[PDB]
Amino acid sequence: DFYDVAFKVMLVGDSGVGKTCLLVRFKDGAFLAGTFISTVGIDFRNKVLDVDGVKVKLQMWDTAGQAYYRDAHALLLLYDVTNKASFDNIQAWLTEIHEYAQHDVALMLLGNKVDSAHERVVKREDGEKLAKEYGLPFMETSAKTGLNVDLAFTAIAKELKR
Numbered sequence: 631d632f633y634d635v636a637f638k639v640m641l642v643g644d645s646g647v648g649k650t651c652l653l654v655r656f657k658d659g660a661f662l663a664g665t666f667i668s669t670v671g672i673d674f675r676n677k678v679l680d681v682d683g684v685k686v687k688l689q690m691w692d693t694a695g696q697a698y699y700r701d702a703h704a705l706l707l708l709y710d711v712t713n714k715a716s717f718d719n720i721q722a723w724l725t726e727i728h729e730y731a732q733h734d735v736a737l738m739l740l741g742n743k744v745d746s747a748h749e750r751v752v753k754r755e756d757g758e759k760l761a762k763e764y765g766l767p768f769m770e771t772s773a774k775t776g777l778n779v780d781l782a783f784t785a786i787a788k789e790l791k792r
């Protein structure tokens with residue numbers, strides 16, 4: 631698959647929030663309810679998307695939640711709607727990104743695991759409100775059901791293209 635433009639996008643957030651699964655879902659269209667394998671170092675995978683008749687390659691970087699920043703064009707920040715601590719830690723992740731990433735990085739906040747599996751503890755409203763407070767786009771997602779996964783990557787690609 632060829633493309634018109636390419637961007638580097640990195641996923642960040644607490645360990646366990648769903649960074650690896652979210653990427654597997656977008657890239658492979660599947661959710662493997664497999665072994666929880668905590669990511670140790672960063673690694674990348676490519677995917678090409680159509681945006682306004684333009685083909686956009688995303689070079690997507692997974693990262694460990696338990697100098698890269700300065701190279702990224704965009705960062706997806708995830709928390710887990712069923713883990714209040716992951717949401718409480720979002721501002722710290724934002725401070726880090728603001729401190730170490732290019733000043734012109736695109737950002738997006740994702741409240742992941744919005745599905746039957748576990749009980750929500752963070753209301754969508756509270757995530758909407760945090761996003762509004764820092765100017766970031768926001769979406770709820772699920773690697774398990776596929777909720778808004780394609781649409782989140784499409785939106786960031788769209789913002790980068792424009």
Ligand SMILES: Nc1nc2c(ncn2[C@@H]2O[C@H](COP(=O)(O)OP(=O)(O)NP(=O)(O)O)[C@@H](O)[C@H]2O)c(=O)[nH]1
Pocket residue numbers: 643644645646647648649650651652662663664665666667668669670693694695696742743744745747748771772773774775
């Ligand atoms: N129900 C549900 N489980 C999910 C979802 N996303 C991930 N999981 C599960 O939650 C756990 C953590 O997922 P994972 O993708 O490994 O998270 P991570 O953010 O990559 N962790 P780390 O930073 O440690 O590498 C796994 O057991 C995975 O199957 C989701 O949307 N829904």
Ligand SMILES: [Mg+2]
Pocket residue numbers: 649650651667668669692693
């Ligand atoms: Mg991982």
